[PDB]
Design an enzyme around this catalytic site. Structure first.
Site, PDB file in Angstrom:
ATOM      1  N   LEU A  18     -30.176  26.770  41.588  1.00  0.00           N
ATOM      2  CA  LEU A  18     -28.797  26.689  41.120  1.00  0.00           C
ATOM      3  C   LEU A  18     -28.368  25.287  40.709  1.00  0.00           C
ATOM      4  CD1 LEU A  18     -27.068  29.047  43.701  1.00  0.00           C
ATOM      5  CD2 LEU A  18     -28.094  29.602  41.491  1.00  0.00           C
ATOM      6  N   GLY A  19     -29.089  24.274  41.176  1.00  0.00           N
ATOM      7  CA  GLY A  19     -28.738  22.909  40.828  1.00  0.00           C
ATOM      8  C   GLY A  19     -29.633  21.869  41.470  1.00  0.00           C
ATOM      9  N   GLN A  20     -29.475  20.621  41.046  1.00  0.00           N
ATOM     10  CA  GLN A  20     -30.274  19.527  41.581  1.00  0.00           C
ATOM     11  C   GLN A  20     -29.500  18.233  41.719  1.00  0.00           C
ATOM     12  OE1 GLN A  20     -33.985  19.695  39.083  1.00  0.00           O
ATOM     13  NE2 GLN A  20     -34.947  19.124  41.034  1.00  0.00           N
ATOM     14  N   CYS A  22     -30.269  13.761  43.240  1.00  0.00           N
ATOM     15  CA  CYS A  22     -31.268  12.787  43.650  1.00  0.00           C
ATOM     16  C   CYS A  22     -31.536  12.903  45.150  1.00  0.00           C
ATOM     17  CB  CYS A  22     -30.800  11.370  43.312  1.00  0.00           C
ATOM     18  SG  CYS A  22     -29.309  10.862  44.188  1.00  0.00           S
ATOM     19  N   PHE A  23     -30.775  13.763  45.823  1.00  0.00           N
ATOM     20  CA  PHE A  23     -30.928  13.965  47.262  1.00  0.00           C
ATOM     21  C   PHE A  23     -31.554  15.309  47.624  1.00  0.00           C
ATOM     22  CE2 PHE A  23     -29.324  10.049  47.693  1.00  0.00           C
ATOM     23  CZ  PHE A  23     -27.990   9.830  48.026  1.00  0.00           C
ATOM     24  N   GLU A  25     -31.891  19.859  46.339  1.00  0.00           N
ATOM     25  CA  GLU A  25     -31.574  20.987  45.465  1.00  0.00           C
ATOM     26  C   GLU A  25     -30.752  22.071  46.162  1.00  0.00           C
ATOM     27  OE1 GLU A  25     -35.297  22.472  43.639  1.00  0.00           O
ATOM     28  OE2 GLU A  25     -36.212  20.605  44.343  1.00  0.00           O
ATOM     29  N   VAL A  26     -30.265  23.017  45.365  1.00  0.00           N
ATOM     30  CA  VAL A  26     -29.499  24.151  45.865  1.00  0.00           C
ATOM     31  C   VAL A  26     -30.098  25.391  45.223  1.00  0.00           C
ATOM     32  CG1 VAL A  26     -27.322  25.381  45.780  1.00  0.00           C
ATOM     33  CG2 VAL A  26     -27.343  22.946  46.307  1.00  0.00           C
ATOM     34  N   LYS A  40     -29.512  24.783  50.633  1.00  0.00           N
ATOM     35  CA  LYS A  40     -29.486  23.383  50.237  1.00  0.00           C
ATOM     36  C   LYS A  40     -30.708  22.676  50.818  1.00  0.00           C
ATOM     37  CE  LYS A  40     -26.509  19.297  50.230  1.00  0.00           C
ATOM     38  NZ  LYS A  40     -25.268  18.671  50.760  1.00  0.00           N
ATOM     39  N   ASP A 131     -12.518  16.001  48.800  1.00  0.00           N
ATOM     40  CA  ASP A 131     -12.887  16.404  47.446  1.00  0.00           C
ATOM     41  C   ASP A 131     -12.458  17.836  47.111  1.00  0.00           C
ATOM     42  OD1 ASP A 131     -13.893  15.925  44.891  1.00  0.00           O
ATOM     43  OD2 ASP A 131     -15.927  16.580  45.414  1.00  0.00           O
TER      44      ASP A 131
HETATM   45  C1  STI Z   1     -26.269  25.664  50.976  1.00  0.00           C
HETATM   46  C2  STI Z   1     -24.968  24.960  51.431  1.00  0.00           C
HETATM   47  C3  STI Z   1     -25.083  23.832  52.311  1.00  0.00           C
HETATM   48  C4  STI Z   1     -23.911  23.136  52.775  1.00  0.00           C
HETATM   49  C5  STI Z   1     -22.600  23.550  52.375  1.00  0.00           C
HETATM   50  N1  STI Z   1     -21.482  22.805  52.882  1.00  0.00           N
HETATM   51  C6  STI Z   1     -20.125  22.995  52.648  1.00  0.00           C
HETATM   52  O1  STI Z   1     -19.658  23.733  51.780  1.00  0.00           O
HETATM   53  C7  STI Z   1     -19.151  22.230  53.502  1.00  0.00           C
HETATM   54  C8  STI Z   1     -17.736  22.610  53.602  1.00  0.00           C
HETATM   55  C9  STI Z   1     -16.838  21.830  54.428  1.00  0.00           C
HETATM   56  C10 STI Z   1     -17.355  20.673  55.155  1.00  0.00           C
HETATM   57  C11 STI Z   1     -16.478  19.777  56.042  1.00  0.00           C
HETATM   58  N2  STI Z   1     -16.523  18.297  55.823  1.00  0.00           N
HETATM   59  C12 STI Z   1     -15.570  17.560  56.761  1.00  0.00           C
HETATM   60  C13 STI Z   1     -15.623  16.017  56.543  1.00  0.00           C
HETATM   61  N3  STI Z   1     -15.314  15.700  55.082  1.00  0.00           N
HETATM   62  C14 STI Z   1     -15.314  14.242  54.894  1.00  0.00           C
HETATM   63  C15 STI Z   1     -16.268  16.422  54.150  1.00  0.00           C
HETATM   64  C16 STI Z   1     -16.215  17.955  54.393  1.00  0.00           C
HETATM   65  C17 STI Z   1     -18.757  20.330  55.037  1.00  0.00           C
HETATM   66  C18 STI Z   1     -19.634  21.085  54.234  1.00  0.00           C
HETATM   67  C19 STI Z   1     -22.475  24.693  51.482  1.00  0.00           C
HETATM   68  C20 STI Z   1     -23.620  25.390  51.013  1.00  0.00           C
HETATM   69  N4  STI Z   1     -23.442  26.490  50.158  1.00  0.00           N
HETATM   70  C21 STI Z   1     -23.518  26.371  48.767  1.00  0.00           C
HETATM   71  N5  STI Z   1     -23.762  25.167  48.130  1.00  0.00           N
HETATM   72  C22 STI Z   1     -23.836  25.093  46.747  1.00  0.00           C
HETATM   73  C23 STI Z   1     -23.663  26.262  45.957  1.00  0.00           C
HETATM   74  C24 STI Z   1     -23.412  27.493  46.655  1.00  0.00           C
HETATM   75  C25 STI Z   1     -23.217  28.810  45.980  1.00  0.00           C
HETATM   76  C26 STI Z   1     -23.351  28.995  44.544  1.00  0.00           C
HETATM   77  C27 STI Z   1     -23.157  30.285  43.944  1.00  0.00           C
HETATM   78  C28 STI Z   1     -22.827  31.389  44.800  1.00  0.00           C
HETATM   79  N6  STI Z   1     -22.703  31.199  46.182  1.00  0.00           N
HETATM   80  C29 STI Z   1     -22.883  29.969  46.786  1.00  0.00           C
HETATM   81  N7  STI Z   1     -23.350  27.494  48.033  1.00  0.00           N
END
Ligand code: STI
EC number: 2.7.10.2
Length: 265
Positions: A18-20, A22-23, A25-26, A40, A131
């Protein structure tokens, strides 16, 4: 050395990239051959493991129906972080894609309430997002929306960041509320980039002097007023997500009971 979130590498299957970055992929994939999931990865070397597994540690403590849920992890390099999958992708892509033309204000406000609910949880738990924007919101079936953070000094999404945060580094739940205000414009314009025609430099100078985006076409002034409350020069002035959630959930009865469908909203 035994964590319940740990899963065996054989239980994961990366199917579609789904994406890339420098750290790492997803990917979209399957877990235990039954659960579709998001995955991830950490590109060995680029970043340290513990610096990476920090995120997974945060996700282990956070649990809310409007927040992407951590499903599992592989903590030994190569590391993998696994979460639920959201059938419709990013809100941003959903908004400008084939579906964007059918969404009307009733749907867009419900999506905002859900995001607000997710952020109200972040607020109660005393965390900061930093963000919040459409590109970091995931969409599932039946228009379910969930807050995420693709980790998309360094890159600064200035157009979505509150001035005190983008200038003086003061990121708080109130600077996220500012972002929510911007997100409301993405929602009402079907995902258009905010401050159209303006580069970062002018956006900084303009908002600095009090400029604020005008009411989008067909968008009720009452919702634009909500945006303006989110964009108050002073962080403390800005409303809480608890307020935002209740206001949006009750929107068509308490604020716009005479609402009538238009061409786009
Ligand atoms: C695979 C993965 C690994 C990690 C995360 N992490 C988060 O989504 C997340 C949300 C909130 C926080 C809280 N944090 C608190 C502190 N502040 C500074 C930053 C945020 C942290 C991580 C998501 C995913 N899921 C993910 N990532 C990219 C794309 C998709 C995706 C794409 C298409 C259909 N379904 C899912 N799904």
């Amino acid at each position: 050395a035994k964590d319940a979130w740990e899963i065996p590498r054989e239980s994961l299957r990366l199917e579609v990239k789904l994406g890339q970055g420098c750290f790492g992929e997803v990917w979209m994939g399957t877990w235990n051959g039954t659960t579709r999931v998001a995955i991830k990865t950490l590109k060995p070397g680029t970043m340290s493991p513990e610096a990476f597994l920090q995120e997974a540690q945060v996700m282990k403590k956070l649990r809310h129906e409007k927040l992407v849920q951590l499903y599992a992890v592989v903590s030994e390099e190569p590391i993998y972080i696994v979460t639920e999958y959201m059938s419709k992708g990013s809100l941003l892509d959903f908004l400008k894609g084939e579906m964007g033309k059918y969404l009307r204000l009733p749907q867009l406000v419900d999506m905002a309430a859900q995001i607000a609910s997710g952020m109200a949880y972040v607020e109660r738990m005393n965390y900061v997002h930093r963000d919040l924007r459409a590109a970091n919101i995931l969409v599932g079936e039946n228009l379910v929306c969930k807050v995420a953070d693709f980790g998309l000094g360094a890159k600064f999404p200035i157009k979505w960041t509150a001035p005190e945060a983008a200038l003086y580094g003061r990121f708080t739940i109130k600077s996220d509320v500012w972002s929510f205000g911007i997100l409301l414009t993405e929602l009402t314009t079907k995902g258009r980039v905010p401050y159209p025609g303006m580069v970062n430099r002018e956006v900084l100078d303009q908002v600095e002097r009090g400029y604020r985006m005008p009411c989008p076409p067909e968008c009720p002034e009452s919702l634009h007023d909500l945006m303006c409350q989110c964009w108050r020069k002073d962080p403390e002035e800005r409303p809480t997500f608890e307020y935002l959630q209740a206001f949006l959930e009750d929107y068509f009865t308490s604020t716009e009971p005479q609402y009538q469908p238009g061409e786009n909203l």
